[PDB]
Design a protein around this ligand. Sequence first.
Ligand SMILES: CCCCCC/C=C\CCCCCCCC(=O)O
Ligand SMILES: [Cl-]
Ligand SMILES: [Cl-]
Ligand SMILES: [Cl-]
Length: 267
Amino acid sequence: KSFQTNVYRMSKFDTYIFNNLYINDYKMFWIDSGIAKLIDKNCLVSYEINSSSIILLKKNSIQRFSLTSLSDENINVSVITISDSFIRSLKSYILGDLMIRNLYSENKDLLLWNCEHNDIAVLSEVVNFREINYSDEFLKVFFSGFFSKVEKKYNSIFITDDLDAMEKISCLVKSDITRNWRWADICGELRTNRMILKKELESRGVKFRELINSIRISYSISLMKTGEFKIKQIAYQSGFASVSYFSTVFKSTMNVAPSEYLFMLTG
Ligand SMILES: CCCCCC/C=C\CCCCCCCC(=O)O
Ligand SMILES: [Cl-]
Ligand SMILES: [Cl-]
Ligand SMILES: [Cl-]
């Protein structure tokens, strides 16, 4: 209920490429073996990562990056998606750090942490096997402390404040994903003018249509993760005008066809 997990198979020397990928919830991912090369197109940095490198992706960010396998065997990429309800339960564990965190910047959307033995073991277990599950207290302490040391390393906010304008925009769109959203609706619903709100899109490198489409793709991904497989139904449930429009945007965003992503999940 707190963590949704996926393990993707990555073939030798394959490359996954994401363009305008909207991060609907906080995510963490890492490879289980070998080496990979992560290229972050938004900041123009590359990382060689190994099985202890954790990549954290901030909620409401718009990602542009590739991941290239450098191993001659299959690599498994584990992905934890953290529920909003679990994040909210961390509020008391970092509130005391308000003075500390108000000094941090808010720009970085993709963060790396090189793990010690104990930390990668816990994260693997979340994705896996224990007869007695970690307690709620253990998990809240582990993840608040983990995010805290990542934030300190970068002097940067990872867990964004509840009042952020991008969260207001995204939450509104996600409340009625098929609505024929236009900028005026956002300004009207948030009672905030365009001069203020537009920086949320500008700083993320998207125009309005690209933003709405990106949120709709991540909705379709969520539907597929629940076991929906009827491509036409998925396209319409997610607010696309047609299957062809859905497929075109999905291909641009994920660099694979919807049918191929379904196979990565269920095949
Ligand atoms: C077409 C690629 C399929 C997904 C492979 C994911 C591998 C590395 C990136 C992990 C973070 C982005 C995951 C997006 C899909 C998801 O939400 O599970
Ligand atoms: Cl629309
Ligand atoms: Cl009003
Ligand atoms: Cl715009």
